[PDB]
Write a protein that binds this ligand. Structure first.
Ligand SMILES: CCNC(=O)Nc1cc(Nc2cccc(C)c2)c(C(=O)Nc2cccc(C)c2)cn1
Length: 187
């Protein structure tokens, strides 16, 4: 299933050789945070381009659900991240690594995937007074060629649009490679 997305990545994410699909990957993750803001529950989304060839998206909403199905022993989070506006499970499938961190009901929950395959079960990693969801992913270099790094202006342009299409939401873009920071919010 995740094998199908890796065999024909272009079908799912867009062109893999000119940057298009690489940036679509971020937008897929952002769209999920935007939907939490449209549901009334998220006021700030933070997109950070890291210096290790990863992007993180962090929202301040309710947190992705963390419950376990008792008979299956798989968390809701894992179901969201592994099963097939193409969905975040596609992003996971085309990421050499993906880290999900969820702050919810006083606890921090974390899980790591490699090419979509979870490495261990969802685990509690501490306590928190805050709620929200953070996804950080390192795109697969077996999939993406030529443009394998994130480009601030492609994200900036798009995140500005989202902020004005979803008035009230605050969207912050941060680049760790040079300290560039933008804040998009409209009234
Ligand atoms: C960085 C990317 N941001 C997010 O993924 N934000 C996010 C997503 C959420 N749910 C969600 C995600 C993907 C697929 C589906 C169906 C739901 C939810 C969500 O549905 N939380 C929620 C909402 C109602 C009840 C419970 C238990 C949990 C909250 N935030």
């Amino acid at each position: 299933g995740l094998d199908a997305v890796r065999k024909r990545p272009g079908m799912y994410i867009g062109d893999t050789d000119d940057g298009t699909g690489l940036h679509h990957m971020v937008f897929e993750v952002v769209d999920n945070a935007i939907d939490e803001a449209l549901a009334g529950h998220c006021k700030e989304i933070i997109v950070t381009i890291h210096a290790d060839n990863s992007v993180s998206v962090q929202d301040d909403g309710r947190g992705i659900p963390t419950g376990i199905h008792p008979e299956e022993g798989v968390s809701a989070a894992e179901v969201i991240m592994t099963v097939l506006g193409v969905g975040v499970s596609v992003v996971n499938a085309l990421s050499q690594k993906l880290e999900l961190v969820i702050q919810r009901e006083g606890k921090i929950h974390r899980q790591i995937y490699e090419h979509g395959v979870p490495q261990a079960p969802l685990a509690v990693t501490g306590e928190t007074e805050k709620t929200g969801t953070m996804v950080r992913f390192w795109p697969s270099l077996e999939t993406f060629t030529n443009v394998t790094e994130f480009e601030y202006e492609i994200l900036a342009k798009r995140l500005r649009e989202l902020s004005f299409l979803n008035s009230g939401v605050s969207i912050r873009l941060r680049d760790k490679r040079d300290g560039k920071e933008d804040h998009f919010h409209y009234e």
